[PDB]
Symmetry: D2
Subunit: 249 residues, 4 copies
């Protein structure tokens, strides 16, 4: 039987590339999304056209709240409902915007940034583990966590907490044979809100080819970590950043 | 005129020792507490007997919620009300208990552990900075973040997020002359919940002296970081762990 | 034309598995060895029997000395003389023994431990780069560098320097399209000098399976890093330790 | 009886400031130097004028060689000869120049850069310990070791090795009461070679005050680490970099 994977924030960009590559490797996929309903349905159609009954969509807000554990349980439930199993969880969904220390209320900013980047991954990990071959979780981290964007405290706190989760969950789930790893992009697909001048600035900074990573290049690292070639790898975060994090100010 | 400090969770143990040492150095202190009212008021009394009106108490739950931002603002406000200035913030208050992946609901565990260890520090940092010499913030971290206690994922996530805040805030608040640093104990005052047998096991692990750090030894590192001897130090986290984090399994 | 790889200390154990796996991927290989002449020649025979003219041996002492630069030039030259190209360098050879701070002279201990683990990798990297498609270097690091073996100062210094070389060379060689990465085992094939009781002690410490990594599992990570699936990865060190480094004392 | 300290490369700049601050705290000092003979004697004169028989000089080349252990043993021996004791060792002496991967020979470059920055500190640490109250060693590291200067591979390897030594020595010497710590400047006193425009470029990168650390600010952190206020601190490296290491490319 074909293994099954949940990918959060999978309708567009990097999550989409991850879902595609997992599907091409022979996984059945749950394409989680929040607002991008059209993109999610389009992707599921494309994958199902390739192999019948191998993709479903699942809408959920991953903002922190008292109902978040239920939403995360439901996401894992949807994989079992559709495919009778859940072998891989990819924590990809992420809010990313400035929250200066000196629009949305601060409580909404905390809920969105810490919810999406850390708490939801934690609750999904809980639900994945409790519902339990080659089982693993892959968390999308950030190569630049120690050299963060100016005025992105909450996002950075989220991504640091995700490192903590990766390590804590790797340790605790090891006896269950569940591996937990991370992939840490530097610059890949640049944020849509970023200006073209700033995009070019970031590109110029990357030692390896003066260009951002393709979404597929990020996906390749995810593929490795879920594969039989990573059977002894747990609690590892693989930087995929073309040397960006090595460059001084 | 004497500088003023806010110390969270200052009624007992490490927070108490920090408040005492800051006060002995010449600081006016806000003693924040949650449940330990008797201890907080008693500490304030002891310090005020030493120097008139140099200590006030401020109660607040630092659990994450929609009122946390108001609560943190009021803690900083209490410093300005009492002393007309706030020069130092020490983020010391912390929930610490296991949250296995496989009586409190999980959403409450999230709120308490991420709130006290990360979100409250962020909001206090916001309020501290907004309301503005030698200004600085000291965050009580954990030397063992990368070798975490089994089944303490939320605690570890919170402490990882605090490292991120320490670094993000150091970067962002440097132009304002506010330094942001951390002190990371290994084993200091062992939890009251811990049995004496387990306490002794941990003591035996410490390379430097086969004993835990006194609260006063942790306080010494805080005192250094707030002092004029650390005026170029920001974004640094000083382990005070007697070599504990250096010891392999 | 098939790509060519140099593997240092390739006659036995992990180096041997790496050479075998690279050969199975379609590389021609230079088997470097120091003392294990019979094993090196036996390996070359085996690989050449598999595919004619795809394996050669090169003997060299990688101890630090005024002749080492020439020895490292010789090893790289060997690949060019046999195969007309050199696409991959794997720095695997390593001296590993205690050097207590409080029989080999200390200067010999420095020469051997810093030589094999750091200086030779540096000199080999230099010769590799100067002589220059998917070019990369993989350095065999240590997942336990920050929780080192008691009384192994020089070994640990060597492996720390190797991390530095990995990052420094990744930065400097990126514009040449040469990637530089690391693979960091925790416990793999236990040292032959280790007693059986201690071997089982280490095995029991590994969260993921309570066993050491096979040399093949280490080799799998090397294969990934040299592959087209890692084209954007440079300056990254992949732990392959089954969560060992995550375990507190 | 006043305690005694050895400071390597103490004739000028940061080493001078450390020797001066130690002397002002009440230490008798050995001022080691290599080429700066006049500056070393002039410093010892100033300190002896302040307090009689409290400063001596000691010439030694710290380049790696087969005689380096003897030189390092002699440096420690000179502290015992002059003062009858040796309480503190500060490893400050350092070669710093580019060694591009693509008229000093490479073997000289290895010997100077790895010798001064790593091997000499190891041998001095060995001799210090063997010859043995508040005993400690302070190693001068580099806050930018993970974001290294382009084409400075050997310097960077040396400073990484010094981190390894700091940790390994802290672990091993903790049972003897000898603490081993590090101070990691970002930009302090800029190389005398540098022009004013290039100096200002580096100054402008520092978040905290747009300026380099004074030698005194670095020395302050060394003073803290040797003091009674750091009695539980071992294996810690304190960045003194004004946030420099936190700034992305
Ligand atoms: N792109 C880079 O250069 C880069 C660099 C470093 C790290 N990363 C990490 O790599 C991962 C993927 O990067 P990316 O740029 O592709 O991510 P992205 O486009 O910024 O976000 C991916 C998805 O996150 C989902 N999301 C946002 N808020 C949500 C919420 N409240 N609830 C549920 N889902 C929510 C959105 O889904 P919908 O569109 O359906 O609403 C969004 O499409 C992220 O974890 C990111 O932090 C990326
Ligand atoms: N002790 C160690 O060995 C060790 C090791 C590593 C790190 N640390 C860190 O060092 C700091 C001090 O350690 P410690 O052992 O002294 O801390 P602690 O006793 O565990 O907690 C300090 C105070 O935190 C306050 N607190 C807890 N939950 C709260 C909440 N929901 N809202 C508001 N306040 C709350 C409590 O105040 P009330 O009593 O008034 O309710 C408590 O007295 C902490 O940040 C800890 O994580 C300590
Ligand atoms: N095995 C583990 O559990 C483990 C753990 C962490 C890191 N690592 C790293 O992974 C790599 C492979 O480990 P391993 O256990 O297979 O290594 P190993 O058996 O200790 O050594 C590999 C080869 O190094 C060569 N070598 C030693 N001294 C040399 C010298 N002076 N000049 C030239 N070559 C010399 C020897 O070649 P000859 O036999 O031909 O003399 C030896 O066979 C090493 O870099 C090691 O540090 C291994
Ligand atoms: N300055 C900064 O911005 C900065 C930044 C990062 C790290 N650091 C570290 O902080 C420490 C002090 O910095 P600094 O700039 O003051 O150092 P420095 O001036 O570059 O060098 C200090 C002393 O090292 C000695 N030295 C050099 N080669 C030697 C050799 N072969 N044998 C013996 N001694 C030798 C020299 O002694 P003589 O003059 O007597 O020949 C020199 O005075 C160093 O360890 C440095 O790596 C400094
Ligand atoms: N989530 C993201 N982190 N960093 C990004 C690119 C801006 Cl430089 S997207
Ligand atoms: N908050 C705390 N972290 N670690 C502690 C000592 C238990 Cl080993 S208390
Ligand atoms: N080279 C080696 N480093 N660590 C090893 C495992 C012994 Cl516990 S071998
Ligand atoms: N030894 C030194 N390392 N870094 C320095 C400042 C040059 Cl920007 S001196």
């Amino acid at each position: 039987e074909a293994p099954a994977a949940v990918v959060t924030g999978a309708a567009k960009r990097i999550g989409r590339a991850i879902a595609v590559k997992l599907h091409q490797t022979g996984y059945r996929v749950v394409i989680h999304y929040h607002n991008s309903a059209e993109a999610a349905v389009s992707l599921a159609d494309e994958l199902n056209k390739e192999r019948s009954n191998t993709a479903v969509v699942c809408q959920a807000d991953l903002t922190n709240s008292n109902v978040l554990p239920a939403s995360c349980e439901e996401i894992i439930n949807s994989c079992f409902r559709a495919f009778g199993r859940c072998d891989v969880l990819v924590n990809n969904a992420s809010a990313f915007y400035p929250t200066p220390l000196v629009g949305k209320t601060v409580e909404t900013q905390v809920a969105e940034l810490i919810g999406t980047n850390a708490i939801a991954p934690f609750l999904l990990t809980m639900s994945f583990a409790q519902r339990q071959s080659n089982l693993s979780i892959v968390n999308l981290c950030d190569a630049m966590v120690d050299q963060p964007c100016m005025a992105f405290s909450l996002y950075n706190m989220g991504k640091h907490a995700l490192v903590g989760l990766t390590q804590s969950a790797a340790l605790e789930l090891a006896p269950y044979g569940i591996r937990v790893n991370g992939v840490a992009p530097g610059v890949s697909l640049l944020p849509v809100a970023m200006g073209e001048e700033e995009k070019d600035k970031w590109r110029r900074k990357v030692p390896l080819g003066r260009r951002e990573a393709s979404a597929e290049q990020i996906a390749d690292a995810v593929i490795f970590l879920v594969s039989g070639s990573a059977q002894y790898i747990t609690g590892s975060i693989i930087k995929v950043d073309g040397g960006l994090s090595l460059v001084h100010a």
